[PDB]
C-alpha cells in the first residue's frame, strides 16, 4: 500500500463517512463506515484477498466525512451507482 494511503488511514477520524479508493483518478472501491478510523484500519490487516487487492491497486484514498449514518448510507449508494467501481459487487 502507498505510504500516503497508510498515513491517511491512520489519521482518519472516528466519524461516519464514505471512502473511495482510486487508481489513476478512477474509483475502484467505495465503502461506508460508522467510524472511518475503525473501518479503514481493517485495510491494513486484510481479512480477504479482495481487501488486499484494493489496498495494493489504489494510488489514492479519498474520505468524505458525513453528518450521520443515514447520510453515509445514501451517499455510499449514490456514489456506487454513479461510478460502479471495479471491486464493488
Ligand atoms: Mn458498502
Ligand atoms: Mn482526489
Ligand atoms: Mn442519524
- Ligand 1 centre distance from Cα of residue 76 (Å): 7
- Ligand 1 centre distance from Cα of residue 58 (Å): 17
Alpha helices in 1-89, H assignment, sequence order: 3-11, 36-41, 49-57, 69-83
Instruction: Determine the Cα–Cα distance for residues 35 and 53; give it in Å rounded to an integer.
Output: 22
- Ligand 1 centre distance from Cα of residue 73 (Å): 8
- Ligand 2 centre distance from Cα of residue 24 (Å): 9
Instruction: Determine the Cα–Cα distance for residues 56 and 59; give it in Å rounded to an integer.
Output: 8
The residue ranges of every structural domain in the chain are 1-89
Residue 14 exposed, middle or buried by CB count within 10 Å (0-12, 13-18, 19+): exposed
Query: What does DSSP assign to residue 71?
Result: H
Q: Under CATH, which number does the domain 1-89 receive?
A: 3.40.1440.10
- Ligand 3 centre distance from Cα of residue 71 (Å): 8
- CA dihedral angle for residue 50, residue 24, residue 85, residue 7, rounded to 10 degrees: 50
Resolution in units of Å? 1.9
- Ligand 1 centre distance from Cα of residue 82 (Å): 14
Asked if 63 contacts 72 with a C-beta cutoff of 8 angstroms, the reply is no
Q: Could you give the 3-state DSSP secondary structure of residue 1? A: coil
56 C-beta neighbours (distance < 10 Å), count: 11
Sign, Cα dihedral of 42, 8, 34, 57: negative
The residue assigned the cell 484477498 is 49
Instruction: From 78, 39, 66, select the one nearest 55 (Cα to Cα).
Output: 39
Amino acid at each position: 500500500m502507498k505510504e500516503k494511503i497508510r498515513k491517511k488511514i491512520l489519521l482518519a477520524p472516528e466519524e461516519p463517512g464514505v471512502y473511495i479508493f482510486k487508481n489513476k483518478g478512477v474509483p475502484i472501491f467505495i465503502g461506508k463506515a460508522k467510524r472511518l478510523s475503525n473501518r479503514l484500519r481493517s485495510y491494513l490487516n486484510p481479512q480477504t484477498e479482495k481487501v488486499f487487492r484494493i489496498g495494493e491497486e489504489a494510488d489514492e484514498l479519498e474520505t468524505i466525512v458525513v453528518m450521520n449514518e443515514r447520510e453515509a448510507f445514501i451517499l455510499e449508494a449514490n456514489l456506487i451507482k454513479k461510478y460502479r467501481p471495479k471491486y464493488n459487487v
